[PDB]
Amino acid sequence: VQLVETGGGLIQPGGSLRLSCAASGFTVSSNYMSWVRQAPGKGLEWVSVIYTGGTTYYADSVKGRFTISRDNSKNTLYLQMNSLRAEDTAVYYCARAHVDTAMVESGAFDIWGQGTRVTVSSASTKGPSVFPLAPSGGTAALGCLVKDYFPEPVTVSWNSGALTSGVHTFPAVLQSSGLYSLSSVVTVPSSSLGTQTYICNVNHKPSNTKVDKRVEPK
Amino acid sequence: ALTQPASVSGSPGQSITISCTGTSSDVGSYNLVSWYQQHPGKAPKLMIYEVTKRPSGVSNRFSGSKSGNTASLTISGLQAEDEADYYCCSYAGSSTWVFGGGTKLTVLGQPKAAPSVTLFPPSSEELQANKATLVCLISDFYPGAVTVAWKADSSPVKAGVETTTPSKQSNNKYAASSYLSLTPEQWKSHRSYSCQVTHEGSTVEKTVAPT
Amino acid sequence: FGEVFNATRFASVYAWNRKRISSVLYSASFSTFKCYGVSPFTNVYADSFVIRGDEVRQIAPGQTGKIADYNYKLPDDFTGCVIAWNSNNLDSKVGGNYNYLYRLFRKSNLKPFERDISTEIYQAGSTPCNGVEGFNCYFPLQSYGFQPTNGVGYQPYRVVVLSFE
Ligand SMILES: *[C@@H]1O[C@H](CO)[C@@H](O)[C@H](O)[C@H]1NC(C)=O
């Protein structure tokens, strides 16, 4: 007994996409089926439901843009998504209503798919712009801001990999633009600032870009 | 959206409770509250339905209740494997459903740890590029839940904020970052900006100034 | 009887068809042929419909289940015979035949020989349905969905019930 979603991917704002959810071990034609979505880092949101006679209901956030349907013969549920917006970026799950042996719903969802990711974004391959984060208990923190690149990943080293103690490269933020930024900071002895050189080496293989940025006290 | 605490934590063997506050037209109106457990990268798992009932296979350490507009999940005898995100759900009328925003449950494996915060102002290079980013880097906190607020002088700023979800560091504490994107004129037109980081009810403020 | 047994179309069980009749059969074409009371007339009635192979057991006195309770019920004192045969070649289609239906919900069990063809929305919960399908408000009939590759218990069977009054 399982549900397998497909169809997710990157789509530009305003575009359309159709998700699919194939059932095994029960028939969608005899069950009450929903879609539920989850934005990255955020909570679950119920999207839509379809009853055995075909009657459908929708969250107000998607009404008029999304359509739930099924193909009994393929034992598959669909979600047609039109006029997609940034806010529709999410993992999309299909879910079966939990029922008793008489097929009466309990109000809960017992069987869930693995989810399919939909990203609504106009991002395309782009290398980063890199800026120094100047230093200003005897330790100083300095770093490199790695801004507006796509897709993941970048790699950051310091002094061409000679400098590893005190390095903390933070996970990137995915901005509403669909581009990524991250920062890398090194904590170093304050006594080294006047005379030791700190350079961050940023590599972004998808755009074939590499950047070295010297980070100096201001 | 039903309202859940962002973070709850307890030690192995203790009991904890997660609340879920809705309204008279959802939690208040039906005995149709369900609870879900969600481990990282996995689908939600049904733990409680009809306010109090457990599906077969679900441990009797999990129990549910309701009072007025607030439902609660109690987990007794906390075990490491219970650490996960938990969501309440209610029928909402007219064949619609509503979920809570989710609670991160931490089963404490070390003492709680306050975040270290570092706030960088825009570089002179970025301002030359006609841009300005404030960078608020938050590290070494445990449990892994924080909220970040930005201020211009003493006024709240919402536009131009991008904040990551916390992620586990190699020392099992957590890190997050928050970025405030400004125009150069915005940066120069205020006396100060601040990054305010709240962890377990404790808020620390870091501040930078163009001058 | 060729009108009955060789009818080209059969009824859904919820809308079971009844024909007033006003040892040749006792044939290797049938897979079930069970008599009650009067082992092998004023009036004879031939009732016919389609159910799943594994539901044919429910077309008998004293049986329970969604067919016996909500679709077609025989009395304890039944005197008559129950005849069934596999109709997978006729009543399955590639992609599935969804035209045969059974009643899944009812406020009470049928009485013997009662027929219910209502399409009223079934109120399973506290909120009135007001004619609309939705949460706990169910369209009361459900399609079988007979596919040729189904196991034998899930294949369509045509059933004729002969009653002797
Ligand atoms: C129906 O099927 C065949 C027609 O070729 C016939 O042999 C059989 O006896 C018929 N059944 C009746 C007349 O009850």
Author numbering:
A (entry chain H): 2 to 82, 82A, 82B, 82C, 83 to 100, 100A, 100B, 100C, ...
B (entry chain L): 3 to 9, 11 to 27, 27A, 27B, 27C, 28 to 95, 95A, 96 to 106, ...
C (entry chain A): 338 to 359, 366 to 369, 371 to 384, 392 to 516
What does the paper say about this structure?
IGHV3-53-encoded neutralizing antibodies are commonly elicited during SARS-CoV-2 infection and target the receptor-binding domain (RBD) of the spike (S) protein. Crystal structures of two IGHV3-53 neutralizing antibodies here demonstrate that a longer CDR H3 can be accommodated in a different binding mode (mode B). These two classes of IGHV3-53 antibodies both target the ACE2 receptor binding site, but with very different angles of approach and molecular interactions. We determined crystal structures of two IGHV3-53 neutralizing antibodies, COVA2-04 and COVA2-39 (Brouwer et al., 2020), with different CDR H3 lengths in complex with SARS-CoV-2 RBD to 2.35 and 1.72 Å resolution, respectively.
Similar to typical RBD-targeting IGHV3-53 antibodies (Barnes et al., 2020b; Wu et al., 2020; Yuan et al., 2020a), COVA2-04 has a relatively short CDR H3 of 10 amino acids, whereas COVA2-39 CDR H3 is 15 amino acids (Kabat numbering). COVA2-04 mainly uses the light chain to interact with the flat surface of the ACE2-binding site and the heavy chain with the RBD ridge, whereas COVA2-39 mainly uses the heavy chain to interact with the flat surface and both heavy and light chains with the ridge. In addition, COVA2-04 binds to the side of the ridge, whereas COVA2-39 binds at its tip. Interestingly, some of these germline-encoded residues are also involved in binding of COVA2-39 (mode B), but to a different location and, hence, to different residues on the RBD. The 53TGGT56 motif in COVA2-39 extensively H-bonds with RBD E484 through the side chains of VH T53 and VH T56 (water-mediated H-bond), as well as the backbone amides of VH T53, VH G55, and VH T56. In contrast, in binding mode B, the longer CDR H3 of COVA2-39 is largely solvent exposed. COVA2-39 CDR H3 interacts with the RBD mostly through non-specific van der Waals interactions. An important feature in COVA2-39 interaction with the RBD is its engagement of the ACE2-binding ridge. Specifically, RBD F486 at the tip of the ridge is anchored in a pocket formed by both heavy and light chains. RBD F486 forms a π-π stacking interaction with VL Y91, which in turn is stabilized by a network of T-shaped π-π stacking interactions involving VH W47, VH F100g, VL Y30, and VL W96.
